[PDB]
């Protein structure tokens, strides 16, 4: 099918990839934070 909700559905998925992405960036900061510790 094709609908306006289909595009909204596609958009829901991209936040999940960001959720992961942010945990990865946060990890790196944590390694430099450990050096200051």
């Amino acid at each position: 099918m094709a609908d306006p909700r289909d595009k909204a559905l596609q958009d829901y998925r991209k936040k999940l990839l960001e959720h992961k992405e942010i945990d990865g960036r946060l990890k790196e900061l944590r390694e430099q934070l450990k050096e200051l510790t």
């Binding site: 099918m1 289909d6 900061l29 944590r30």
Partner: protein
């Protein structure tokens, strides 16, 4: 995409689709911020 499928439009009630949209909009804001908060904390830690 996988989610872009029509089966999902049919499967979920309209009350759920509406709810889903509203929650994630708020969610993303917190997600970028966690990088910004920690970074702020790294600079705070050096002082």
């Amino acid at each position: 995409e996988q989610d872009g499928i029509g089966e999902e439009v049919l499967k979920m009630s309209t009350e759920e689709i509406v709810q889903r949209t509203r929650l994630l909009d708020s969610e993303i804001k917190i997600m970028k911020s966690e990088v910004l908060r920690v970074t702020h904390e790294l600079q705070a830690m050096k002082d």
